[PDB]
Amino acid sequence: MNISYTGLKLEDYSDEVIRKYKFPNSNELERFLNREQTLTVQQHKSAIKLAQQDFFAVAGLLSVGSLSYIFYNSVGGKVIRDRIRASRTKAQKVIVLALAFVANAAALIIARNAITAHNFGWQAA
Amino acid sequence: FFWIILLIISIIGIFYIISIIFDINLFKAFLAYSTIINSISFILLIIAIIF
Amino acid sequence: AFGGFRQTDNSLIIDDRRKIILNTRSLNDFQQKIYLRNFFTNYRPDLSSYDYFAFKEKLRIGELFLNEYRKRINNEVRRAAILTPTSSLREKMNHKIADQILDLSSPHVRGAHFQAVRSWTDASKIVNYVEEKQTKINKYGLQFPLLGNMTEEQCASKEDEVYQRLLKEMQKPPKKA
Amino acid sequence: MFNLNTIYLSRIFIEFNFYFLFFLFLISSIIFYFSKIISIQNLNQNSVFNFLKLANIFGILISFFIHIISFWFYCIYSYNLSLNIFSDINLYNSNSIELLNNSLLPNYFKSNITIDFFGLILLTLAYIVGFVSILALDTRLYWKNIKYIFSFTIFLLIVYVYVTVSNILLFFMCYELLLIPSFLIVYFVSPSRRAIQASLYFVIWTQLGSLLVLIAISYIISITNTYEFNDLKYFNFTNSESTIIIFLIFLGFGFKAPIWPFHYWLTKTHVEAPSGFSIYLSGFLVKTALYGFYKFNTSIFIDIDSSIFIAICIMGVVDSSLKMWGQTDLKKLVAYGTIQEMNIIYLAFCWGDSCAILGGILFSATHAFLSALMFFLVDCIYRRYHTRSLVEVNGILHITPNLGLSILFMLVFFSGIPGTIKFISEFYIFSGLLEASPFICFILMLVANVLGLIGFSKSWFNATFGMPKKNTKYLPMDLSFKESYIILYCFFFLFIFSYFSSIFF
Amino acid sequence: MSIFSNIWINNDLNSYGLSILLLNIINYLIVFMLILSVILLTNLSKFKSLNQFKEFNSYNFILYSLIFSLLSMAGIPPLLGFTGKFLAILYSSFKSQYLLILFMTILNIFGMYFYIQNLRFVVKKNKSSILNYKNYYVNINYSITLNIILLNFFNFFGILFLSDLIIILNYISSYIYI
Amino acid sequence: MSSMLIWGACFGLFTRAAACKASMIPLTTSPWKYPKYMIVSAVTFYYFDWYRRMALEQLCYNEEKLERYQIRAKLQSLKIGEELSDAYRESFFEHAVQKNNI
Amino acid sequence: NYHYDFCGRAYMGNPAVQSPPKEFFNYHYVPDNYPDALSGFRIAYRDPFEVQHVFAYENWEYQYDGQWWSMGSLACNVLFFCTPLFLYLILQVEELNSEKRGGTSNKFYHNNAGFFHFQIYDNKQ
Amino acid sequence: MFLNPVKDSEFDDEVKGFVPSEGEVRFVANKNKECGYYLQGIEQCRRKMVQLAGDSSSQFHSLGFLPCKRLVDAHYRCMTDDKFGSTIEEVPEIGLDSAQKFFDCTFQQLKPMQSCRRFFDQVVRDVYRANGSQLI
Numbered sequence A: 001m002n003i004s005y006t007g008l009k010l011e012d013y014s015d016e017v018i019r020k021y022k023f024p025n026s027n028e029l030e031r032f033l034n035r036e037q038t039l040t041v042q043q044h045k046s047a048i049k050l051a052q053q054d055f056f057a058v059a060g061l062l063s064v065g066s067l068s069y070i071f072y073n074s075v076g077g078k079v080i081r082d083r084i085r086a087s088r089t090k091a092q093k094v095i096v097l098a099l100a101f102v103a104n105a106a107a108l109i110i111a112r113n114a115i116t117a118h119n120f121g122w123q124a125a
Numbered sequence B: 001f002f003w004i005i006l007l008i009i010s011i012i013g014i015f016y017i018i019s020i021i022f023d024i025n026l027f028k029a030f031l032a033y034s035t036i037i038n039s040i041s042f043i044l045l046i047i048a049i050i051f
Numbered sequence C: 001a002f003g004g005f006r007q008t009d010n011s012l013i014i015d016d017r018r019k020i021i022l023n024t025r026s027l028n029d030f031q032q033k034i035y036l037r038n039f040f041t042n043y044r045p046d047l048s049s050y051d052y053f054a055f056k057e058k059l060r061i062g063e064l065f066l067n068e069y070r071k072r073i074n075n076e077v078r079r080a081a082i083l084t085p086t087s088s089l090r091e092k093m094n095h096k097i098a099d100q101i102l103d104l105s106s107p108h109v110r111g112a113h114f115q116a117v118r119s120w121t122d123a124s125k126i127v128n129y130v131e132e133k134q135t136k137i138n139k140y141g142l143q144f145p146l147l148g149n150m151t152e153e154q155c156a157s158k159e160d161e162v163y164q165r166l167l168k169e170m171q172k173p174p175k176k177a
Numbered sequence D: 001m002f003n004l005n006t007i008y009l010s011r012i013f014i015e016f017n018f019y020f021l022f023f024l025f026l027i028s029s030i031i032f033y034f035s036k037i038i039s040i041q042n043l044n045q046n047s048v049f050n051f052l053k054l055a056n057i058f059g060i061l062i063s064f065f066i067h068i069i070s071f072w073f074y075c076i077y078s079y080n081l082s083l084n085i086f087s088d089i090n091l092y093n094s095n096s097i098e099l100l101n102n103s104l105l106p107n108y109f110k111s112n113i114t115i116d117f118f119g120l121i122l123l124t125l126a127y128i129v130g131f132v133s134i135l136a137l138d139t140r141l142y143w144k145n146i147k148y149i150f151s152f153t154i155f156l157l158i159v160y161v162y163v164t165v166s167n168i169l170l171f172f173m174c175y176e177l178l179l180i181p182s183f184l185i186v187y188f189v190s191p192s193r194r195a196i197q198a199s200l201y202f203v204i205w206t207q208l209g210s211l212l213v214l215i216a217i218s219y220i221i222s223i224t225n226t227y228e229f230n231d232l233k234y235f236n237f238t239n240s241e242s243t244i245i246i247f248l249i250f251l252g253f254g255f256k257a258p259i260w261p262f263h264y265w266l267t268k269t270h271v272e273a274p275s276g277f278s279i280y281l282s283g284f285l286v287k288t289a290l291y292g293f294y295k296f297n298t299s300i301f302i303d304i305d306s307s308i309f310i311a312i313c314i315m316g317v318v319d320s321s322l323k324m325w326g327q328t329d330l331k332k333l334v335a336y337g338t339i340q341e342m343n344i345i346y347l348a349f350c351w352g353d354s355c356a357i358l359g360g361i362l363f364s365a366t367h368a369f370l371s372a373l374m375f376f377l378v379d380c381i382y383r384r385y386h387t388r389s390l391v392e393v394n395g396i397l398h399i400t401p402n403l404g405l406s407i408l409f410m411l412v413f414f415s416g417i418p419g420t421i422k423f424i425s426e427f428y429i430f431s432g433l434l435e436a437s438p439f440i441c442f443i444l445m446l447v448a449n450v451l452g453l454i455g456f457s458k459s460w461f462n463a464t465f466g467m468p469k470k471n472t473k474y475l476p477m478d479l480s481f482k483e484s485y486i487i488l489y490c491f492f493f494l495f496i497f498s499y500f501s502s503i504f505f
Numbered sequence E: 001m002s003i004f005s006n007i008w009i010n011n012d013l014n015s016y017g018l019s020i021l022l023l024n025i026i027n028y029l030i031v032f033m034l035i036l037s038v039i040l041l042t043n044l045s046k047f048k049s050l051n052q053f054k055e056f057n058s059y060n061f062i063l064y065s066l067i068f069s070l071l072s073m074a075g076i077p078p079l080l081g082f083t084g085k086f087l088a089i090l091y092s093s094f095k096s097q098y099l100l101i102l103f104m105t106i107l108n109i110f111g112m113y114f115y116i117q118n119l120r121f122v123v124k125k126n127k128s129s130i131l132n133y134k135n136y137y138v139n140i141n142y143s144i145t146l147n148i149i150l151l152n153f154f155n156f157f158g159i160l161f162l163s164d165l166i167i168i169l170n171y172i173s174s175y176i177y178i
Numbered sequence F: 001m002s003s004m005l006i007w008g009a010c011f012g013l014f015t016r017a018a019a020c021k022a023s024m025i026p027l028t029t030s031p032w033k034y035p036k037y038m039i040v041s042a043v044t045f046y047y048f049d050w051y052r053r054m055a056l057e058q059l060c061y062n063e064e065k066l067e068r069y070q071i072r073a074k075l076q077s078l079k080i081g082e083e084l085s086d087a088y089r090e091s092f093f094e095h096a097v098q099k100n101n102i
Numbered sequence G: 001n002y003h004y005d006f007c008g009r010a011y012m013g014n015p016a017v018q019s020p021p022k023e024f025f026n027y028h029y030v031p032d033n034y035p036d037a038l039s040g041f042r043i044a045y046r047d048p049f050e051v052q053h054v055f056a057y058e059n060w061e062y063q064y065d066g067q068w069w070s071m072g073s074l075a076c077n078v079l080f081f082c083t084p085l086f087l088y089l090i091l092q093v094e095e096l097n098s099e100k101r102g103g104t105s106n107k108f109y110h111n112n113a114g115f116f117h118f119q120i121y122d123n124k125q
Numbered sequence H: 001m002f003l004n005p006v007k008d009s010e011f012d013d014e015v016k017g018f019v020p021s022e023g024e025v026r027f028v029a030n031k032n033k034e035c036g037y038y039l040q041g042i043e044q045c046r047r048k049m050v051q052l053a054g055d056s057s058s059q060f061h062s063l064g065f066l067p068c069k070r071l072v073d074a075h076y077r078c079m080t081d082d083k084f085g086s087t088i089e090e091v092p093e094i095g096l097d098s099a100q101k102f103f104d105c106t107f108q109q110l111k112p113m114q115s116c117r118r119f120f121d122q123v124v125r126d127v128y129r130a131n132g133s134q135l136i
């Protein structure tokens, strides 16, 4: 490989050529080396962590809500279900009604949060 | 010299068995004709290789 | 590595640049690449992959923009019909509006046709028109929420730049004649 | 205001939904294999078949919900990516953002996922049609074919890899994998005895086209050693190679997506297949071919006249429409309707990557839902009235009013009334065809929407109306809640999908 | 083979067609071994006509082993025989033999139906009894079943591991200086 | 995943389970065959993992020699009259004079 | 006008009363099929004429070579046979207008350089 | 890109588009296809040099990007068909400004090659427009 610093002298090259092929600022060199000119690897990692957490929350909530709804409303015919729910205690009725809705709604809200970019610092005027 | 002989043999064999392989009624005949069909296919591959 | 497919034609190829003669059936993979397959398959082959993706998007947006011109002029005609009584309606329409309606016909705007048959020159002109509109918008930074994405620091810098530009434009004197 | 969080959430959701499905399938299969010495149903209330049915149904459903979320994320991501590329005009600035993969799950087949609107539409069709078909096949699976409860999960995984891959070879392999599960379902689950021959016809007819597509793929791979599906931009095929590739691709994918004269297998299979699997076949399995044809023909540069292909598609439409009248069998009539719609869709793809693709995609979606509706109605008729022939079935409305109402509304939707994606797709295709070749457009519209429509409506109206005086001791009752809600959901989708964002259409 | 200032460049591996031929032979032998092991596990006197394919209509392992072996011999994509056929077609395309590809495809499709038609006969009115009786009970051989299971696994998932087999076959053929 | 020994152990376990299911015997029959199958599978697949890489390395080395054969085979395959043509004359002299270093 | 006596070559069922058919193709089911038991599992005896009509078309076949051309009407059969050719010729004549004007032509347009519709194009670090 | 400013513009910044000649487009496309190796080499060598001598304390820190000079000169010669000088420094005055912009893009701002190829192609286009019949 002939592309190396070996054998190169600043005397051979003109001053304008050296200025042209001069290293930029140290900060610019570091950004270019680390590929952090626009976004930092830590920002990417934080975004990925939030994405994974959001997916796990959404999927778990959807599964819980679906299964709870199925098992609570899959006990038999209309008469049987109505009688079972009538004999059901107050707190048991509340959970049976609220668990599936809350799980599904939380999943949908977490989904909506990502597309809605409210946390933007330019809110003014 | 081998290429033309192989091609002629392959063509004749294919056009001769296309109808015979559907005339058998025996398990042994089925096995033998499976071997024959695979042999013809490998002969075509051999022609391609020697090209 | 790219390869080639054996050729059967018995034609002769004369390459004046390299000063050699070949035969179509005798070409190898690299020779096939150099002589055959060297034709262009896009409006602007000179552009890179990223540049041509931008060109394609601008062309699509420009076609939609011309269709938007047609839709806007149609809406204006409806507005004229509702506001103005049938008397004097055609008299007032026989003006800029009618000429624009005719000038935005199918050859110039692809209303519902599958393809707008445009030469590469026409596509370049449409992309240039879209880029001119984009430049005019970006002068004042009207594309932050729509037709653009920027960070908070970028938005602040753009606001300061637009403020300076507006101040300078206002301070400039009126154009003579 | 678009931020990297949305990008990573989109990518993570797309990647992880596949593994959700795969882990569900893996756990269910492990339970099934290791719970019993012999993998057949134990005819008692405590069988593992109930658990497997529950797992399959509510894995498909939950994955469908997650797919809705991921598809919405993709729509936002693609729109904002186009905006990022288009907006900036400064020469120094360029959009070069690089994403780092997660460290939790690996990339299946070491491939970076790439998603498109057409692919996600195809995946959504897979989910919904698979849900309907699995709901249909409950009465068919009994005590030796329970192993086929996982067929739709396998289909979903295959389609997921098919639509989320940027590799030509993986694309082709996913396309070719669909044969085995479908053949096994038709062979072991179909009640009719003619299904045995129908399965062989299906296999041979589809495999001929599969071999054609295989030859085309071999031409592409051997000539261009690349497999990334994007290096083809830097390689140009000569005229002869390009014409051979397009001919092979069109014929091979038209063997699957029925085209004239290659629809004999489709008619046979639809007539003799399970009523629950016919829904899945017509709705989805004929559109993977369209998706593959679109991908290949838009990637390759073709400098040939498409008049021959357009003529083939139009001939198929005309043939199916003319034959609609002479069918007293409702299932065969619906099969001819499927052939007609598929040929129109295929015609929508005969102008390369022009705007016809949007109408083609919308028409593919509407045809999937409409065919599912029609085959489900035929299934209900056949299951409650023990026949699906017009001579033996008459006056459905007067004994089963809900079923007759469903038939009538199905006919209205099939007619293409405004306010339906069917009408929107017809409008797209006909608006393009009017400028492409107005006389051909007139002939196609006339035939399909008058002669074929009248032939289609004759049998359905005759079945719906009349007076059921025969076999009064054996008349059924009505649709069930499951059937009624399936019909309602089909209608609801056909109506409300017209409000989907117009950016992608 | 390209020449650039008397420097030869070879992007083609000559000892590749032989490796593909060896791969096809090995794949056919493996599938033949699978089907013959299924036959040997059972009573041999029952199978004497194509109609007797119904006699394979026995417990799920034998039934589905036969079905998948027949499909693999036919060349259905996911199975083992498809790999050999696809690689033969790929090498033919690489060598630019369109007529050979045409004839290979004709033979392949005809043979495919030839294998497939037996699936029609596999259907049986009842369950067959093709096992030999020993000690008053049917004799099922665990060793042959295990060998059939390994063959079934490789028949199903040959595509996944085919790269290693291709590497080994190319390594073997590279010694030949042709 | 990454350990070929563990992969082979899992393969042997599943092979034993599948063999029991196919034979229609309880999965707990002949329990001693589970560790036997796991060990045999692990060892054989570990050896094959080593062998495939050795074969790949030797194949890469053999391709170097095969390149020499291809270059000389191409020159000898030239049709009569082409060995002294302007497109092959220099290469033919290189292989017939410079490489005649015995 | 169509009557059975004078139709000649436009076949149709005869008006004369006939005895029911003794043998006819019937529904057959796969061995060990699971019965369909919707709505109480009540099956009525099938009418022989109706079953015969159900299975007649599937088994109908041409008796002699070339009967297809003569059956029905020769002119209509030839027109149906040539329909694909007519469609192709109409398409080509229409494409002549497109060529001479400048409108849409029957070709695989390649405006996008292999860029699929709304595809995600990204790179990884 | 491909936009010319309006000389007599009422407001500060106005641009009117133009379409390059088919000959210019063909020349640029052919030369890019032939010389694309040099541009990828420039990118890879830029990254390599930054890694090797990016640190201030490095011995070769005072020779930054000089090894890229040979690649840049080769790319210029390939794009210009060996005419108009054998080095980038010999670029004609018509393309000198675009050459300076390209150098600023590549080595000082360290912008993406997607951006800097625009300026390099602008240099080539300036030369081609200036000469016309000399390049073809």
Ligand SMILES: CCCCCCCCCCCCCCCCCC(=O)OC[C@H](COP(=O)([O-])OCC(O)COP(=O)([O-])OC[C@@H](COC(=O)CCCCCCCCCCCCCCCCC)OC(=O)CCCCCCCCCCCCCCCCC)OC(=O)CCCCCCCCCCCCCCCCC
Binding pocket: D022, D025, D026, D029, D030, D033, D039, D106, D107, D108, D109, D147, D154, D157, D158, D161, D162, D170, D173, D174, D177, D180, E059, E060, E061, E064, E065, E078, E148, E149, E150, E152, E153, E156, E157, E159, E160, F011, F014, F015, F017, F018, F019, F021, F022
């Ligand atoms: C007790 C065993 C427990 C096993 C638990 C799971 C562990 C893995 C399996 C290990 C088994 C080892 C021993 C062999 C047993 C099988 C043979 C036998 O003789 O059994 C007799 C034994 C007893 O006899 P029997 O049950 O009476 O006989 C019935 C017959 O065997 C008939 O039964 P069947 O009809 O159910 O058989 C399956 C049927 C149909 O089976 C299938 O279709 C398999 C579907 C698997 C689900 C996922 C598919 C996803 C596809 C997406 C698209 C990919 C495209 C890639 C490009 C190339 C094309 C693939 O036939 C086929 O498989 C042929 C088609 C093959 C298609 C190729 C698909 C390749 C997918 C590769 C994995 C991708 C993973 C991605 C995610 C991870 C990324 C890092 O049989 C059984 O107990 C049941 C066996 C059923 C199959 C088991 C495996 C299915 C689940 C696989 C999950 C893991 C993925 C696959 C990769 C595995 C590692 C390579």
Ligand SMILES: CCCCCCCCCCCCCCCCCC(=O)OC[C@H](COP(=O)([O-])OCC(O)COP(=O)([O-])OC[C@@H](COC(=O)CCCCCCCCCCCCCCCCC)OC(=O)CCCCCCCCCCCCCCCCC)OC(=O)CCCCCCCCCCCCCCCCC
Binding pocket: E030, E033, E143, E146, E150, E151, E154, E157, E158, E159, E161, E162, E164, E165, F012, F015, F016, F033, F036, F037, F040, F041, F044, F048
């Ligand atoms: C992608 C396409 C791929 C296509 C693949 C096609 C072939 C697939 C199926 C066949 C594969 C071989 C299966 C193993 C041999 C069969 C017998 C056996 O082991 O089961 C009986 C035996 C059953 O034991 P048992 O039920 O307790 O008692 C049985 C009797 O009661 C009492 O038993 P016994 O006392 O009567 O007999 C005891 C003896 C019975 O076993 C035997 O006697 C072996 C019989 C086979 C001999 C030929 C093996 C050749 C292996 C090399 C690769 C070619 C394979 C070709 C196979 C097909 C040939 C037609 O057991 C053993 O010792 C087993 C050792 C097996 C490994 C032998 C390795 C020899 C390597 C020689 C060459 C080395 C490299 C040289 C390089 C030179 C360079 C200059 O097996 C076991 O104990 C473990 C079973 C569960 C794990 C099986 C794991 C199999 C792994 C196969 C790896 C294949 C290569 C890697 C993959 C390549 C593709 C990517």
Ligand SMILES: CCCCCCCCCCCCCCCCCC(=O)OC[C@H](COP(=O)([O-])OCC(O)COP(=O)([O-])OC[C@@H](COC(=O)CCCCCCCCCCCCCCCCC)OC(=O)CCCCCCCCCCCCCCCCC)OC(=O)CCCCCCCCCCCCCCCCC
Binding pocket: F005, F006, F009, F031, F032, F033, F035, F036, F038, F039, F042
């Ligand atoms: C980093 C690596 C990552 C990847 C993983 C890699 C590793 C994967 C493998 C993982 C597993 C490792 C296993 C290590 C030991 C392997 C030994 C070996 O060589 O295997 C082959 C060999 C079996 O093959 P074979 O019997 O020679 O084959 C004959 C043919 O089938 C021919 O059939 P046949 O019909 O002609 O005859 C049938 C057979 C009928 O006979 C049989 O059934 C075979 C014998 C079975 C019983 C053996 C005695 C068990 C009790 C004493 C064990 C030794 C002391 C252990 C002390 C442990 C202290 C911590 O005939 C015979 O008797 C012939 C063989 C003569 C006797 C051979 C005695 C071998 C002893 C091996 C001891 C190994 C452990 C040593 C530990 C030393 C520690 C310092 O030995 C065994 O497998 C022994 C049985 C081990 C499994 C027992 C399973 C049932 C009981 C489970 C109780 C669990 C309680 C705790 C539950 C905790 C959770 C709640």
Ligand SMILES: CCCCCCCCCCCCCCCCCC(=O)OC[C@H](COP(=O)([O-])OCC(O)COP(=O)([O-])OC[C@@H](COC(=O)CCCCCCCCCCCCCCCCC)OC(=O)CCCCCCCCCCCCCCCCC)OC(=O)CCCCCCCCCCCCCCCCC
Binding pocket: G010, G072, G073, G074, G075, G076, G079, G086
């Ligand atoms: C190439 C140059 C073109 C430009 C020049 C000008 C146009 C000249 C065209 C040629 C016209 C003269 C030749 C036609 C002779 C008739 C056809 C024939 O030969 O088949 C055997 C002929 C028909 O056998 P069949 O159809 O099996 O008999 C059925 C039974 O009658 C039982 O019947 P059914 O009671 O069940 O009722 C069914 C009936 C009624 O069926 C229906 O109601 C359903 C609709 C049927 C189609 C009606 C025509 C619709 C428009 C067709 C447009 C085609 C466009 C594509 C082709 C373009 C080619 C440029 O079906 C028929 O129509 C059968 C009658 C014969 C076909 C008549 C219609 C097609 C004739 C060809 C037209 C070509 C037009 C080209 C120009 C187009 C504009 C640019 O057999 C007989 O001879 C028996 C008597 C049939 C009635 C004959 C009435 C007099 C016809 C003129 C006689 C003198 C001809 C002198 C020729 C001199 C040398 C050139």
Ligand SMILES: CCCCCCCCCCCCCCCCCC(=O)OC[C@H](COP(=O)([O-])OCC[N+](C)(C)C)OC(=O)CCCCCCCCCCCCCCCCC
Binding pocket: C008, C009, D212, D215, D239, D240, D243, D244, D247, D248, D251, E098, E099, E101, E102, E105, E106
């Ligand atoms: C419809 C038939 C029944 C259904 C089965 C389908 C079988 C046919 C499938 C389509 C095959 C392609 C036909 C169109 C070819 C168009 C290009 C062409 O040949 O023009 C001359 C082409 C185009 O030439 P050109 O004039 O356009 O430009 C090049 C001109 N020269 C060379 C002079 C510079 O010329 C050639 O190079 C000859 C190529 C001939 C290739 C014919 C064999 C193809 C083999 C692979 C496919 C085999 C599939 C078999 C499937 C099983 C069948 C049972």
Ligand SMILES: CCCCCCCCCCCCCCCCCC(=O)OC[C@H](COP(=O)([O-])OCC[N+](C)(C)C)OC(=O)CCCCCCCCCCCCCCCCC
Binding pocket: D034, D035, D036, D037, F013, F025, F026, F027, F028, F034
């Ligand atoms: C320092 C080393 C110390 C080592 C100490 C020794 C450790 C020994 C560990 C033994 C674990 C045994 C687990 C048995 C679980 C049984 C579950 C059950 O009930 O299933 C029955 C089920 C059902 O079987 P069935 O067929 O009887 O079904 C009954 C159900 N009805 C009635 C409906 C039919 O089947 C099974 O799963 C049993 C067979 C599979 C057993 C698999 C054992 C794998 C053991 C792996 C050991 C790995 C060790 C690695 C060491 C590495 C060291 C470096």
Ligand SMILES: CCCCCCCCCCCCCCCCCC(=O)OC[C@H](COP(=O)([O-])OCC[N+](C)(C)C)OC(=O)CCCCCCCCCCCCCCCCC
Binding pocket: D305, D307, G086, G089, G090, G092, G093
């Ligand atoms: C009820 C109303 C009915 C209305 C009429 C419906 C259609 C009637 C039939 C129209 C025929 C049109 C023929 C001319 C078009 C030829 C297209 C072509 O280029 O094909 C070449 C084709 C091949 O085309 P190709 O595709 O290979 O061309 C190369 C590709 N391009 C063109 C893009 C470069 O060659 C043929 O095989 C043509 C065979 C023609 C056989 C003779 C046909 C005579 C038809 C006479 C009709 C009666 C007179 C007209 C009546 C109407 C007057 C108003």
Ligand SMILES: CCCCCCCCCCCCCCCC(=O)OC[C@H](COP(=O)(O)O)OC(=O)CCCCCCCCCCCCCCC
Binding pocket: A055, A056, A059, A060, A063, A064, A067, D019, D020, D023, D024, D104, D105, D106, F001
């Ligand atoms: C139904 C709940 C769904 C929750 C949403 C995320 C699902 C992710 C897929 C899980 C698949 C099943 C387990 C697989 C185990 C395995 O073998 O997993 C093996 C692999 C290990 O991979 P590696 O070996 O490469 O490290 O597991 C993983 O990679 C990650 C597994 C998922 C981690 C999140 C667990 C969330 C737990 C939620 C508990 C509450 C659920 C309530 C439901 C009613």
Ligand SMILES: Nc1ncnc2c1ncn2[C@@H]1O[C@H](COP(=O)(O)OP(=O)(O)O)[C@@H](O)[C@H]1O
Binding pocket: G013, G014, G015, G016
């Ligand atoms: N399948 C049929 N095929 C042909 N003609 C029929 C058929 N059914 C009825 N017809 C006609 O119906 C008429 C007889 O009507 P029908 O209801 O049977 O009362 P009836 O036989 O007592 O006169 C005849 O003209 C007969 O030709």
